[PDB]
Amino acid sequence: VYNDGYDDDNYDYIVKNGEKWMDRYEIDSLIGKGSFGQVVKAYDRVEQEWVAIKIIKNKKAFLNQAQIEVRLLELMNKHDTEMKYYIVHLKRHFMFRNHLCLVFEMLSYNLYDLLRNTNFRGVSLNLTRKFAQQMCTALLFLATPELSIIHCDLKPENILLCNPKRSAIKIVDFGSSCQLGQRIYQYIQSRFYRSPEVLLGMPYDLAIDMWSLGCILVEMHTGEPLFSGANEVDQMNKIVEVLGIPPAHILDQAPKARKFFEKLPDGTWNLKKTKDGKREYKPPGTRKLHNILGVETGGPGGRRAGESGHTVADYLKFKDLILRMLDYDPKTRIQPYYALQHSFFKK
Ligand SMILES: O=c1ccccc2[nH]c3c(Cl)cccc3c12
């Protein structure tokens, strides 16, 4: 018997379609999962609108983290009252049968689902530009000094369409988020979207979100993750295939440097040594983004050959922007304000 038979063995609330809470919320159905718990679709009889309700796990550590989430959402929504900065709206929260319940506006499906709808053909560079511009603008919001918020888990599943016919988006799931002052985890971000500084055990700031976004935009256009590591070692290696060996001034300050690399007597770094003539990775920097994107060959896989809004010049700009976002150095990685000024976004 977990929580008088309301929970399961994983601290999640056993959801029941048609159930009605507090003479207010008619529960329609389950529509999301996460480490945090579950999200359900519900009708709010009082306000007379569909909502989404995040049902946090009934367990101390989860509840505590969700309380941080709430603080940051409420802090964001208070600045963005007009709802023009692409951040989901927290309508209210309540405790119900020992679970914290967060009530958000209802939204459509996420960008992973959108990619899946084209059978991972990827979406157009025109639509990619639109998502890029909205996300940079959202990331600029988070960068306002009074917020200074690191989302910490950007990925396609956490960017959602407002409406399925339209290109407007909102960022959701601030359940791993923190402010620039109060950083509390070392192992953060979804692995494909994890920055080098986090892989390397280093301190991190808002620039980890920009890294993640760089990875996201490429995926939105090619249909597959740019760096799809099966574990941290594979991840770091896949980054090195495209961008080369991280600079020495970084690896010299990196606690986990020796998990992936070796420092030679003359002070330079290589990939850690490999057994018995085993070969698995392309040599450093030889997996060119130029080729991944199909800059001069009709886009990714040649699938955009002779389509408008997919010229070579369009791609060269896109590529340039993406490499600025994937700068190894967090201090020089492009920041939201300057990203919006990039030639990729020219009217
Ligand atoms: O915060 C989330 C986290 C994870 C997974 C799914 C998810 N769907 C949502 C919808 Cl429709 C509205 C608002 C939030 C979400 C949400």
Author numbering: 135 to 481
Copied sentences from the primary study:
The dual-specificity tyrosine phosphorylation-regulated kinase 1A (DYRK1A) is the most prominent member of the DYRK group of kinases. DYRK1A is involved in elementary physiological processes such as neuronal differentiation, apoptosis, cell cycle regulation, transcription regulation, splicing, EGFR stabilization and synaptic processes. dyrk1a gene is located within the Down syndrome (DS) critical region on the human chromosome 21. DYRKs belong to the CMGC kinase family and are structurally related to cyclin-dependent kinases (CDKs), mitogen-activated protein kinases (MAPKs), glycogen synthase kinases (GSKs) and cdc2-like kinases (CLKs). Based on the pathological consequences of increased DYRK1A activity, the enzyme has been suggested as a therapeutic drug target for treatment of DS and AD.
In order to improve the physicochemical properties of 10 by downsizing the structure, the [b]-annulated chloro-substituted indoles 11–15 were designed. Testing of these new [b]-annulated indoles revealed 4-chlorocyclohepta[b]indol-10(5H)-one as a novel submicromolar dual CLK1/DYRK1A inhibitor. To confirm the binding mode of the [b]-annulated indoles, we determined the crystal structure of DYRK1A in complex with the representative inhibitor 11. The binding mode of the inhibitor observed in the crystal structure was in agreement with the one suggested by our docking analyses. Specifically, the flat heterocyclic core element of 11 was located in the adenine pocket and kept in position by a hydrogen bond between its carbonyl oxygen and the ε-amino group of catalytic Lys188. The chloro substituent was directed towards the backbone carbonyl oxygen of the hinge Leu241. The latter topology suggests a weak halogen bond, although both the Cl···O distance (3.9 Å) as well as the σ-hole angle (141°) were outside or near the limits defining this non-classical interaction (< 3.27 Å and 140°–180°, respectively). Limited direct contacts between the kinase and 11 suggested that the inhibitor likely achieved its potency through excellent shape complementarity. However, compared to the model compound 10, the new congeners are less active by two orders of magnitude and are nonselective versus the closely related CLK1. Regarding this parameter, 11 displayed a fivefold improved solubility compared to 10.
